[PDB]
Amino acid sequence: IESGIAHIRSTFNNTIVMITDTHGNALAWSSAGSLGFKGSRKSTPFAAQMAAESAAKSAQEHGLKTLEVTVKGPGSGREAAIRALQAAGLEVTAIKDVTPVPHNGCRPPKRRRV
RNA sequence: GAAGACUGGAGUGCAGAAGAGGAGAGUGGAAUUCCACGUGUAGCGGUGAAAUGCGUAGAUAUGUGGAGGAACACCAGUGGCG
Numbered sequence: 001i002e003s004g005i006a007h008i009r010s011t012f013n014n015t016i017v018m019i020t021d022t023h024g025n026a027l028a029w030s031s032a033g034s035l036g037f038k039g040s041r042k043s044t045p046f047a048a049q050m051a052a053e054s055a056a057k058s059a060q061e062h063g064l065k066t067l068e069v070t071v072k073g074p075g076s077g078r079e080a081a082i083r084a085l086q087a088a089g090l091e092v093t094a095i096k097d098v099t100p101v102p103h104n105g106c107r108p109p110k111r112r113r114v
Numbered sequence: 115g116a117a118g119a120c121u122g123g124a125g126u127g128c129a130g131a132a133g134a135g136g137a138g139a140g141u142g143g144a145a146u147u148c149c150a151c152g153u154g155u156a157g158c159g160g161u162g163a164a165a166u167g168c169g170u171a172g173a174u175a176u177g178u179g180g181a182g183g184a185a186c187a188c189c190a191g192u193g194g195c196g
């Protein structure tokens with residue numbers, strides 16, 4: 001409405017972008033798979049470019065001049081989408097890293113190729 | 115072998131110090147999974163490439179509460195104790 005927030009999760013397989021309110025309910029979303037990418041083409045920064053553009057440009061109807069980006073996931077598609085959202089008109093107030101680091105909680109799945 | 119003597123071995127007392135040494139009872143936070151709720155739309159997941167799999171009974175993402183189990187981020191170092 002006036003100032004929402006943007007959630008992004010660009011893992012090594014996909015880039016999902018979110019736009020919500022400041023109290024945190026969904027408005028519009030897009031993904032690298034929604035644009036027609038089949039193989040591992042999702043993980044590229046360019047697929048994140050199209051996802052970010054198509055998600056920010058569809059947030060115009062809701063109405064938002066400011067937003068903040070919360071970046072989660074270890075993939076290679078964060079800066080691209082952050083810049084694409086910032087360069088569509090809405091200025092990103094601040095950027096945060098929200099990766100879920102555990103304090104040695106539960107054992108991870110076994111190492112690959114053994 | 116026997117009878118004595120000594121303190122440089124061994125032990126006791128006195129004054130200090132460090133420590134993931136052991137056993138019993140009780141509390142803490144972050145995170146994974148499950149459950150309920152509010153917008154929320156067509157995909158999510160995964161590989162070198164895919165498919166099986168989950169998803170219009172409406173998933174992923176998304177904020178708010180509840181349950182349970184296991185291991186203890188930084189400190190952390192050919193550091194410490196046995």
Ligand SMILES: [Mg+2]
Nearest residue numbers: 122123124125
């Ligand atoms: Mg002595």
Ligand SMILES: [Mg+2]
Nearest residue numbers: 144145146181
């Ligand atoms: Mg919890």
Ligand SMILES: [Mg+2]
Nearest residue numbers: 109146147148
């Ligand atoms: Mg599982």
Ligand SMILES: [Mg+2]
Nearest residue numbers: 174175176177
């Ligand atoms: Mg949920």
Ligand SMILES: [Mg+2]
Nearest residue numbers: 177178179180
């Ligand atoms: Mg929760």
Ligand SMILES: [Mg+2]
Nearest residue numbers: 135194195196
């Ligand atoms: Mg020793």
